Write a protein that binds this ligand. Structure first.
Ligand code: HEM
Ligand code: HEM
Ligand SMILES: CN(C)CCc1cc(F)c(F)c(CCc2cc(C(F)F)cc(N)n2)c1
Ligand SMILES: CN(C)CCc1cc(F)c(F)c(CCc2cc(C(F)F)cc(N)n2)c1
Ligand SMILES: C[C@H](O)[C@H](O)[C@H]1CNc2nc(N)[nH]c(=O)c2N1
Ligand SMILES: C[C@H](O)[C@H](O)[C@H]1CNc2nc(N)[nH]c(=O)c2N1
Ligand SMILES: [Zn+2]
Lengths: 419, 415
């Protein structure tokens, strides 16, 4: 039928019909809900490698119909010709190439349909760099450097995606092996502990195993590990003057700066797959700007990440013998004031979780008003601190899967046969 | 499939859920859309004879299985005996053992409840002989006094007669057994608890003489056998209360704040074997954030962030200062400090969530699963620094269960 979502703080009720265009399984059934599973479904739309014609063309016709609907053509001359063009193409190459207009429409709409992203109010303001002519790891490096430089924009951050050649036969994939374009190494210490970012211990070891000489610090920017057309990946060092970094200080605790903490300014997801009309872009690094809690709650305070809660609490002179003192909670707040005060002072774009979630509510309103819906994953939209004092906490959401979309994909080292 | 798997992304522990195969009723999701954040996805609708027969059977089978007597002579004769009642009376009566098992497992099956590590230690008060609202008051006073235990709180449930035709329901009209009155002022302000303004109006209309203060314990509005509800004042010496002070801020006690010790849900329906127990108030003890985050700091509730932040001398001209977050923590420190100091049972969100992970893992071990509602299990503050945040969960409905039911003033036929 049609489904209402209610906000329990304001009583606003929105009526969703967009969900009737969803195509892929969520993982839930009438009997089981998988809303907190990280990767619930394996329901693809095309399979394994090079698809047959009855597999690829129907997904292609769907996207071409959607795009031409979007611009109030549809059935027009260009639409019908574009159909016959894609059809001849799949007959002669088993794939097809998107026009520049289609590529831009698909990237933006992948962002617009990403249920887990609180930042989608900006979706239509996305700079797309077409890198489909790229042939080598060096060329991917050059494209990524220009990406990182354009996106950073001396701190006034700008949204971008750079789109390398689509998958052909599955053995010629372009990949960025780094999960984000800029991350810190994680070093396995002999005395069992971990230096740097512990999430990157494996990837940091692949880098070392590939020739990288680690400086062995707490904030070593990792090299890029770039794979072009299925070949072995290659290491490249991002010029540090393109890597904007913010030293973390606290507006009250003068001792905070003495913690020797910094973070980088540009979040840049580079291990996801962008799916458009059955085409799969296995290398599509995209970037935007941070929500402060991403750095200061998750990066800094997860137990398997930087885990700095105890040391900050120690400096704060907090009773850390029992949880009911809420010392973790108190430090957590202060760290996130620090991150926000630092980025803002160095005029690096950042948004707090209050303003960020307020904007998403406004985006939800806009999307129901003009599109009849907005897929939204509550579990990922609600921020990891102060959930209930943000408006999304009180907002019912519907989650469904629209195409074009960003998908997860296996880490290429589980997959790649070397040579 | 015969097995679904859940992973903890912080610990890498992976558990295998077989128990979801035994779930029977809807979650609200479809195969193409998830409704995991929807809060709620007829009175004459009492089960028919043929409807009730498999529900009873499934429940009795489950019960004899649990006591390792499945297929036994006593099992078969119980089944036979339940069947005869449904045939003859169009309903049946639970034995005392079954009632206790049913109510414990409704708590066990409550996917939204983080405190379920305690489910088997539940004191069950059988009140199926009650016939009038005065009798209900007597039962509920005894529940309160037993559960409160001078601050050393004990979880309990009082079960009133089950539904018959939908026209003789027993109902506690209160949502909780102890709540504070809310009063809307002519100028648009609200005195007391803004969440309780509607029910406060019902009581006053029923005759309640309101003190018009900020912490007026509301009266009980008790409905027996489908008659109009009646008012009773819980004796004030049974309502344990805690003044809220701060361990560091001298001024906090000057906010005049206090809360009650006993959380006691009274508007939910307990469903066992197809039978509906429309009045079944249960109580435990608080997790700190229920008071500290939601009761005090929701904009729709007491909304004292601004007053606390002011007395904290915080910069409130821009959100990015995180003055709200900073004030919310201290309020929650105060709530925990004050209960602990007065030796009233309370649990903080870190201990509670950690215990629930242990609980979940045990339930996977001994039961084959544990349905759980991540949207609700995760505390309303500091979510990611508590271990449940990183814990994948599967949500599904098992019976016996606790269910929502429509508010009684929306359906009652006044006499
Ligand atoms: C511009 C400001 C943006 C903000 C503040 C923002 C914020 C967020 C946050 C907080 C998450 C939660 C995931 C996590 O916490 O790890 C997320 C997820 C996501 N975002 Fe955005 N984002 C922004 C831009 C973008 C852009 C430009 C794209 C794509 C072009 C994008 C696509 C996604 C996707 C695909 C996910 C889900 C990724 C996953 O499942 O791991 N976002 N975003
Ligand atoms: C023993 C201490 C207990 C603690 C600390 C506890 C904690 C909680 C919390 C925090 C919630 C979420 C409530 C909300 O945010 O509105 C909840 C929900 C719930 N609890 Fe427990 N609880 C306890 C005992 C019990 C008992 C004894 C029962 C019944 C016998 C019970 C049944 C439920 C149910 C049915 C829900 C879901 C409420 C709903 O769906 O609206 N709980 N619990
Ligand atoms: C699996 N978990 C641990 C990942 C944690 C994580 C570590 C990182 F370094 C990192 F950059 C991210 C980006 C999320 C993100 C992406 C984007 C988009 F513009 F690209 C914008 C934004 N604001 N946030 C996430
Ligand atoms: C449906 N929701 C939105 C209502 C909000 C709400 C407001 C309140 F005042 C209140 F007390 C509760 C108690 C839940 C609860 C129940 C129990 C159990 F032992 F009874 C223990 C516990 N710790 N908590 C919930
Ligand atoms: C919209 C959303 O489902 C709703 O606000 C939920 C979110 N999670 C919750 N979790 C708990 N414990 N209590 C609640 O009232 C809610 N409310
Ligand atoms: C278990 C749960 O699915 C997992 O911890 C999720 C929960 N919500 C999240 N929300 C965001 N924004 N980011 C995350 O990584 C996660 N992780
Ligand atoms: Zn679901």
């Amino acid at each position: 039928r049609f489904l209402k979502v209610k906000n329990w703080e304001t009583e606003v009720v929105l009526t969703d019909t967009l969900h009737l265009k969803s195509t892929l399984e969520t993982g839930c059934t009438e009997y089981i809900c998988m809303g907190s599973i990280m990767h619930p479904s394996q329901h693809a739309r095309r399979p394994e490698d090079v698809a047959t014609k009855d597999q690829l063309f129907p997904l292609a016709k769907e996207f071409i119909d959607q795009y031409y609907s979007s611009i109030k053509r549809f059935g027009s001359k260009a639409h019908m010709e574009r159909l016959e063009e894609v059809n001849k193409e799949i007959d002669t190459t088993s794939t097809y190439q998107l026009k520049d207009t289609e590529l831009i429409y698909g990237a933006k709409h992948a962002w617009r349909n990403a249920s887990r992203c609180v930042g989608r109010i900006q979706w239509s303001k996305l700079q797309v760099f077409d890198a489909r002519d790229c042939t080598t790891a060096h060329g991917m490096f050059n494209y990524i450097c220009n990406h990182v430089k354009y996106a950073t924009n001396k701190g006034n951050l700008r949204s971008a995606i750079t789109i390398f050649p689509q998958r052909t036969d599955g053995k010629h994939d372009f990949r960025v092996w780094n999960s984000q374009l800029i991350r810190y190494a994680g070093y396995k210490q002999p005395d069992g502990s971990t230096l740097g970012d512990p999430a990157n211990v494996q990837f940091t070891e692949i880098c070392i195993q590939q020739g990288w000489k680690p400086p062995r610090g707490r904030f070593d920017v990792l090299p890029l590990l770039l794979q072009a057309n299925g070949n072995d990946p290659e290491l490249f060092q991002i010029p540090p003057e393109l890597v904007l970094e913010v030293p973390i200080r606290h507006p009250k605790f003068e001792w905070f700066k003495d913690l020797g903490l910094k973070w980088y300014g540009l979040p840049a997801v580079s291990n996801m797959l962008l799916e458009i009309g059955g085409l799969e872009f296995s290398a599509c690094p995209f970037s935007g700007w941070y929500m402060g809690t991403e750095i200061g709650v998750r990066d800094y305070c997860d137990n398997s990440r930087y885990n700095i809660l105890e040391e900050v609490a120690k400096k704060m002179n907090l009773d850390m013998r029992k949880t009911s003192s809420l010392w973790k909670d108190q430090a957590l707040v202060e760290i996130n004031i620090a991150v926000l005060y630092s980025f803002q002072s160095d005029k690096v774009t950042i948004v707090d979780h209050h303003s960020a979630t307020e904007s998403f509510i406004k985006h939800m309103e806009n999307e129901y008003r003009c599109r009849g819906g907005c897929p939204a994953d509550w579990v990922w939209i609600v921020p990891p601190m102060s959930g209930s004092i943000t408006p999304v906490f009180h907002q019912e959401m519907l989650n469904y899967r629209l195409t074009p979309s960003f998908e997860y994909q296996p880490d290429p080292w589980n997959t790649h046969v070397w040579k």
